Amino acid sequence: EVETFAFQAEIAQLMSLIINTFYSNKEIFLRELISNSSDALDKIRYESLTDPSKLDSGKELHINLIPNKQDRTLTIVDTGIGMTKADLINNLGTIAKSGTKAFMEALQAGADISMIGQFGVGFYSAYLVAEKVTVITKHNDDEQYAWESSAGGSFTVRTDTGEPMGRGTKVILHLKEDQTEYLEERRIKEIVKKHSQFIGYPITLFVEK
């Protein structure tokens, strides 16, 4: 049972700008997603300070990067607070309407696409490198859900029957054909060291057979 939704017009505009603008510095997508994971981990850590049972769904607070060359996917897994169904529908827990408004003024007033995370909408930088994004998420207060979009103005939400997650978020990037450098170990390591060297959670880069 799959529900299909229209993006708000402003978010559709943000996504088309990300997809259509010539902009070579695509690697920042990974910094933005890792920063989102760190923010999500901070949130469940804070809740756990006054309620330890918040971590009954998993005590480890971490970020995994899982490349798969056969599937042409890069998956960013975190054990943060996760998202409810309502969060997913409401632009993956972001204030994306007002954030987009600010970002697009900045782009005409000098800024470039790499500054996107300063406006709270860094998630959508995934579409610099992905033709499709799948988000699997589990929040303590809701069931496990899958969000998905290939842009084009719509996204889907369904209950996820896949592998149970415990708590957190998985962002599956179905990479564009010309963006497979982001599956190579040495490229991912370089980007993490350049842009994510001070993230306060372990980031484990998985290797492949």
Curated annotation (Swiss-Prot):
Residues that the record marks as modified (N6-acetyllysine) are: 43, 69
The PTM entry states:
ISGylated. S-nitrosylated; negatively regulates the ATPase activity and the activation of eNOS by HSP90AA1.
Q: Where does ATP bind?
A: 36, 78, 97, 123
So which domain of life are we looking at? Eukaryota
Give the multimer and partner information: Homodimer. Identified in NR3C1/GCR steroid receptor-chaperone complexes formed at least by NR3C1, HSP90AA1 and a variety of proteins containing TPR repeats such as FKBP4, FKBP5, PPID, PPP5C or STIP1. Forms a complex containing HSP90AA1, TSC1 and TSC2; TSC1 is required to recruit TCS2 to the complex. The closed form interacts (via the middle domain and TPR repeat-binding motif) with co-chaperone TSC1 (via C-terminus). Interacts with TOM34. Interacts with TERT; the interaction, together with PTGES3, is required for correct assembly and stabilization of the TERT holoenzyme complex. (Microbial infection) Interacts with herpes simplex virus 1 protein US11; this interaction inhibits TBK1-induced interferon production.
The protein's job, in short, is:
Molecular chaperone that promotes the maturation, structural maintenance and proper regulation of specific target proteins involved for instance in cell cycle control and signal transduction. Undergoes a functional cycle that is linked to its ATPase activity which is essential for its chaperone activity. This cycle probably induces conformational changes in the client proteins, thereby causing their activation. Interacts dynamically with various co-chaperones that modulate its substrate recognition, ATPase cycle and chaperone function.
| Domain observations | The TPR repeat-binding motif mediates interaction with TPR repeat-containing proteins like the co-chaperone STUB1.
Q: What is this protein called?
A: Heat shock protein HSP 90-alpha
